[PDB]
Design a protein around this nucleic acid. Structure first.
Ligand SMILES: CC(=O)O[C@H]1C[C@@]2(C)[C@@H](C[C@@H](O)[C@H]3[C@@]4(C)CC[C@@H](O)[C@@H](C)[C@@H]4CC[C@@]32C)/C1=C(\CCC=C(C)C)C(=O)O
Ligand SMILES: Nc1nc2c(ncn2[C@@H]2O[C@H](COP(=O)(O)OP(=O)(O)O)[C@@H](O)[C@H]2O)c(=O)[nH]1
Ligand SMILES: [Mg+2]
Ligand SMILES: [Mg+2]
Ligand SMILES: [Mg+2]
Ligand SMILES: [Mg+2]
Ligand SMILES: [Mg+2]
Ligand SMILES: [Mg+2]
Ligand SMILES: [Mg+2]
Ligand SMILES: [Mg+2]
Ligand SMILES: [Mg+2]
Ligand SMILES: [Mg+2]
Ligand SMILES: [Mg+2]
Ligand SMILES: [Mg+2]
Lengths: 669, 80
RNA sequence: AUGGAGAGUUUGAUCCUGGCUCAGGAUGAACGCUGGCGGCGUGCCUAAUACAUGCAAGUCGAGCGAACGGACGAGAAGCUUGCUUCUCUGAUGUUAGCGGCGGACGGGUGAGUAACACGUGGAUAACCUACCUAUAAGACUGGGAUAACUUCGGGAAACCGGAGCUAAUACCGGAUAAUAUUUUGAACCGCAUGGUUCAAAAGUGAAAGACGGUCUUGCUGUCACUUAUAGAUGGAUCCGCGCUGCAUUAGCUAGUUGGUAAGGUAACGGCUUACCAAGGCAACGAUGCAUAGCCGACCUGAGAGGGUGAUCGGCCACACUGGAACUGAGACACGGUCCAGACUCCUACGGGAGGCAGCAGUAGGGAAUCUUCCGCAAUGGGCGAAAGCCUGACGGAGCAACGCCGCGUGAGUGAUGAAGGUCUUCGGAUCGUAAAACUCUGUUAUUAGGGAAGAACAUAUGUGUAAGUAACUGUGCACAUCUUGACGGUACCUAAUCAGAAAGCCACGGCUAACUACGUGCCAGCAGCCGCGGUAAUACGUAGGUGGCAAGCGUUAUCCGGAAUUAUUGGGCGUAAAGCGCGCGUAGGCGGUUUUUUAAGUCUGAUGUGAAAGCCCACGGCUCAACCGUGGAGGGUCAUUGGAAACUGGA
């Protein structure tokens, strides 16, 4: 009938932070407080605070699970960035901050673990300023640190709250103590200056020396936050129930609504150039984005989606404009702190789960049947680690493929592909932890035990020396007689130029009919390796002479002659083995550049160059693909998880003596 | 379980108790009457009459079928 | 008379034989491409796989006690005569519990079953039957409990116990009543056993009240209750015949076959037990193995036949697997109980719970099959005196071109053969009256109004009449009136606007309707068969054109056809596949001429039945059609009975 909460009162937020900063503690406390006048499961949880609907999505911290952060920030409106008080901004805090910035998500910072030894609110704020380059300012001050932390001075209202116990109840609203009054007023002045740096009206009002009103300053903070120009910084300890109510109040006061947020742009299916703005309007057409897909053992497949524009009732038909099909929305569910409730309708700015959607993956658009809009999808990072995977028992390869399909539908960042050359299946993930979890889930949930290893590297061969050679095959002894004879100069071609066949035949010594057959024989013979079984590349074959018989000559005979010519050229030209070389571009802070270049040179690669980029550095190098195995872990260890890289095949290079001999021995036996 | 099914469980238990008591009584009377008829006793006719009484009351209660009661009476009164 | 088509392919060529292939029809279909609408149908064929969640079986207060509840309307004035307590009256109502009936129907599925399971035709003098109907006779006299409820104790829960009290249409004793049982006599009759009727006695138990009318507690209405005999309905058993593959399954059987006795059952019966005997089945296929629900019917075929057993109807079987009984008229019971087993779930770790092959839905399997929808308004069912409650039966809506049927995507004029594509002999031909343009319509579509039937009723209120009454109320019947729609403001109708939104698929060498240009060059590719492709490809891909179909068109799978290619209809064995190497001979098959007789086969007449739906013929109703309805005809190797004697069979 009528939505229990209005767009102006709806809040979609996400708790993001570094590992073990207190995301799940904070979320559990939030759910408990909203649910009083707690198990955290599902993509999102709906609660109510002060007559406001609050949908909360708790995100993972590990760089291996950045897909969850990405797909949550895509559909979320605001974020709470949780910081460990003792350490402030950490590498994954920076990563989630950059993702939220790329999605233009307003954020409020929350300094958790104030009671922990070494807690330093000022140092956490300084880390916000330095590491992130963020216009963050405190809107609260902690009275006491570590075990002494016992009150919080709200600065918008210059009011102190004293917490008498760890239970989160019996908070005393008192006036700021005199000894902290000066510090509180200085913090308020700093906050006002920070907001005025974005607001010109507020700036003039403050320069006029007139007293700023509580309502005016709240409005200003809300405007700056919704513009993603100001970050309010709060403090507390979720474990001991201090500051959580203030944090929820700030979520309500400062984080935007689906109205305050910027609109969403999509493409008509039939008019991709056409642009459609989907504002938060119940009366408008229904368009929603499916951001998560899971399976619940009780109710079946759940598709968690965020509705941007329109409304949709359970037990109806919608369009999946990305798959261009029709989906039956049978049931609609919302997950609460303690229970799932079936809900008859969903309005703009609501996150819900559908029961009954088949063939609807994350990133799909669900639009009204008549409509054909397609909302903007999500971009996820490319794989950073690759492992050849294979079932321990070949009888389970079908189960393995089906599990890989289901797992790729569940997780966008996990990929699986077959390599033609090697005939191996490779799995790409975000890290070692990601791939390890996926292997274990395949082993247990899907009951497919698999073993993983470093992907095989497809090597190539070439001729280092030039030589004229001849091949002559005679098979006249028995029955039909076959004669072939060719004289070919084999030359090391310029690297990367490929095989080049030239026909310097004069006088028709080799009938023109058989020359294409000679070329085909050379191609086959070079496809088959001449030193270790790998294809031969970068060779110029110049067929300059030959002989033939008016009858015995045949295409197969000339192919045999070409094969013997390539065999004697491999004997006479000193073939080498080539290995793929990857162009590797590494980005990291300058303070780890020496470590990265040392590791590059230790990988038998060479540093091509360096160059500044933004506030960081970029290193360009060429490294063997074999030596690039497991490079993401080493880079993250060298850079404290701050380093990133990309790699692409660049060219082939000669394998060193010992490595080539080892390859050869392995291939022979 | 249905409410009427639970109620039927209770009522079935009650009916079974009553029926088995009455059936045991009539079986005992029939056995006594048959023994008395087999070995002539001055109580023979009174015992046979009691047996027939209980057999017919059982048949009317539906513990045995009318034809079952008829067979019992026929054999008892032919022996006596 | 209502009905029957063939073609390609073995050769240098030929005739024959022979297989292979194709042209037809069909589907619970799937997939590819495409896709406007309406009507009527159909939609998990796979995993009888496991199942979250909701619902699918209740009802009766006019059987019963109790509790809650509190009108109408009593008492004191708080001086508030509008608010107040208990000392009342307490009505309209609601309920957990005892009790009655119903949960054995309805709905699902096809696992098992090769069997009197099913179909057909018969038999029961070997049987049972609540509710319903008819008739007759009754309903007399007493009693002890118990739930609920109160109290105490133990539990997370499931819920458990101890003590105390109270009802009945709950239970029990006694009285009278029998066509029932025992004995005696008699009459008649029949399919061995036996059946029906009459007359005597002996043993012998049934029941209940509730709501009303008249009120004389006497009479009496409705409902309910008991016994007996009939009817109807439903169920049970037996028998002839029919109904499947294998002999690379030839022996099987020991309660087995029969008898005697007993027990047991609604009932006959080795149904079971004790005794006696050695019987019983089987080449007319026993036994074993495999597979399978059967039928009405459905597809195909000229027929004979072949294939199948979805939807709908009948019968059967099953309800996690196996066994068992209880209650009951009826079950050895889908949403009951007990035990065992497998599996799953909850737990406070003490202990508890469950069975979607009901309707939706989930997971899984699969090439593949739908909504966790609305309503009891119609029909039907359960309970009730009734209103009414329940009813995932059912009536509807939703989804799917899945099938069939219907209508669209425009019509008239339109040479001046417009542009443009393709080919060209460079003249021209063709797309083409196609187009453009003028004129016309609105089936459809959009907008706005009107708007069915399906609805009969029941109940209630008035009278009239019929049985009974001493007379009413009531009961049966008849005529009137108020009210009752999920679908649904849907079908349909009216008015206005626009050709404007609405055509795709395959094929074009022969079979086979439809040919040309480019690219390729035994490559890429095509293909049902024969085959095509190496520079002139009507066979590969594209383009133009053409052909067949059309909201569908193609491909794959399966069945019948063509196939006389298992040949009864309707084929063969010298050389094409096929005469056992040849005797002797068993069973079986077949059998010379005449006469008399029988009537098993054979022919002919009558009666009963072969449900309904379906197919065919006719008619009627949806604007047509599909579809729906109503009659007819048909369908048996069917059964009983009466006739004929040539042929086959018997004497
Ligand atoms: C916010 C949240 O609920 O995160 C949870 C949820 C989480 C992100 C999980 C880690 C990992 O399985 C994640 C992946 C990507 C693992 C690979 C696939 O199976 C994905 C379909 C899956 C989705 C999210 C999930 C299941 C979490 C973690 C990390 C736990 C830490 C360690 C060291 C194992 C977490 O609880 O923080
Ligand atoms: N000292 C301290 N520890 C805290 C606080 N809040 C949470 N933690 C702990 O820090 C860890 C963070 O774990 P969790 O809440 O799951 O956070 P996540 O890693 O961000 O998901 C846990 O051990 C928490 O108990 C706090 O206020 N103080
Ligand atoms: Mg966490
Ligand atoms: Mg079967
Ligand atoms: Mg034929
Ligand atoms: Mg039952
Ligand atoms: Mg069930
Ligand atoms: Mg179901
Ligand atoms: Mg599947
Ligand atoms: Mg035939
Ligand atoms: Mg021969
Ligand atoms: Mg011979
Ligand atoms: Mg021989
Ligand atoms: Mg018929």
């Amino acid at each position: 009938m009528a939505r229990e909460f209005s767009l102006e009162k709806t809040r979609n937020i996400g708790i993001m932070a570094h590992i073990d900063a207190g995301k799940t503690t904070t979320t559990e406390r939030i759910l408990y407080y909203t649910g009083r006048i707690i198990t955290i499961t599902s993509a999102a949880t709906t609660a109510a605070w002060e007559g406001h609907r609050v949908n909360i999505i708790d995100t993972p911290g590990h760089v291996d699970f950045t897909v969850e952060v990405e797909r949550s920030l895509r559909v979320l409106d605001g974020a709470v960035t949780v910081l460990d008080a003792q350490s402030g901004v950490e590498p994954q805090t920076e990563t989630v901050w950059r993702q939220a910035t790329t999605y233009g998500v307003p954020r409020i910072v929350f300094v958790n673990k104030m009671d922990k030894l070494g807690a330093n609110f000022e140092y956490s704020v300084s880390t916000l300023h330095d590491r992130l380059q963020a216009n963050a300012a405190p809107i609260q001050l902690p009275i006491g640190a570590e075990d002494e932390f016992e009150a919080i001075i709200d600065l918008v209202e210059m009011k102190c709250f004293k917490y008498t116990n760890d239970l989160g109840t019996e908070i005393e609203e008192i006036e700021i103590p005199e000894d902290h009054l000066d510090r509180a007023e200085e913090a308020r002045a700093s906050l006002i200056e920070a907001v005025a740096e974005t607001s010109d009206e507020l700036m003039e009002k403050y320069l006029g020396d007139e007293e700023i009103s509580v309502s005016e300053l709240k409005e200003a903070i809300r405007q700056a936050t919704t513009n993603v120009e100001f970050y309010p910084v709060l403090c507390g300890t979720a474990f001991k129930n201090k500051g959580v109510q203030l944090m929820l109040d700030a979520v309500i006061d400062y984080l935007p609504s689906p109205l305050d947020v910027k609109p969403i742009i999509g493409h008509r299916a039939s008019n991709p150039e056409e642009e459609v703005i989907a504002k938060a309007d119940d009366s408008a057409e229904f368009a929603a984005l499916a951001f998560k897909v899971m399976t619940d053992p009780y109710v079946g497949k759940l598709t968690f989606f965020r509705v941007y524009s329109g409304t949709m009732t359970s037990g109806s038909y919608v369009k999946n404009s990305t798959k261009g099909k029709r989906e039956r929305v049978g049931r609609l569910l919302q997950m609460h702190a303690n229970s799932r409730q079936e809900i008859d309708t969903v309005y703009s700015g609501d996150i819900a789960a559908a029961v009954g959607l088949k063939d609807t993956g994350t990133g799909d658009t669900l639009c009204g049947e008549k409509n054909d809009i397609i909302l903007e999808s999500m971009e996820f990072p490319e794989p950073v680690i690759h492992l050849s995977v294979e079932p321990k028992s070949k009888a389970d390869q079908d189960k393995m493929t089906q599990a890989l399909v289901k797992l790729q539908e569940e997780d966008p960042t996990f990929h699986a592909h077959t390599d033609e050359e090697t005939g191996q299946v490779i799995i790409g993930g975000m890290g070692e932890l990601h791939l390890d979890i996926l292997v274990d889930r395949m082993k247990k949930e899907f009951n497919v035990e698999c073993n993983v290893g470093a992907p095989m590297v497809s090597y190539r061969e070439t001729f280092k020396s030039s030589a004229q050679v001849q091949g002559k095959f005679s098979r006249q002894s028995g029955g039909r007689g076959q004669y072939g004879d060719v004289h070919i100069e084999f030359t090391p071609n310029e690297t990367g130029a490929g095989f080049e066949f030239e026909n310097a035949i004069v006088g028709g010594v080799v009938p023109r009919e058989y020359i294409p057959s000679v070329e085909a024989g050379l191609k086959d013979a070079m496809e088959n390796g001449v030193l270790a079984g790998y294809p031969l590349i970068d060779v110029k074959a110049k067929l300059y002479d030959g002989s033939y018989h008016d009858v015995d000559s045949s295409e197969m005979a000339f192919k045999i002659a070409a094969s013997l010519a390539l065999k004697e050229a491999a004997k006479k030209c000193d073939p080498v083995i080539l290995e793929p070389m990857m162009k590797v571009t590494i980005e990291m802070p300058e303070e780890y550049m020496g470590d990265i270049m040392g590791d590059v040179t230790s990988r038998r690669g060479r540093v091509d160059g360096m160059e500044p980029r933004g506030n960081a550095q970029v290193v360009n190098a060429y490294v063997p693909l074999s030596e690039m195995f497991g490079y993401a872990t080493s880079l993250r260890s060298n850079t404290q998880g701050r380093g990133t890289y990309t790699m692409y095949f660049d060219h082939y290079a000669e394998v060193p003596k010992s490595i080539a001999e080892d390859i050869i021995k392995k291939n022979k036996g | 379980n249905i409410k009427s099914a639970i109620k039927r469980v209770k009522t079935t238990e009650k009916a079974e108790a009553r029926n088995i008591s009455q059936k045991s009584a009539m079986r005992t009377a029939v056995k006594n009457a048959k023994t008395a008829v087999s070995n002539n006793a001055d109580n023979k006719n009174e015992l046979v009459s009691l047996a027939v009484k209980l057999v017919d009351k059982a048949a009317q209660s539906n513990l045995i079928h009318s034809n079952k009661a008829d067979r019992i009476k026929s054999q008892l009164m032919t022996a006596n």
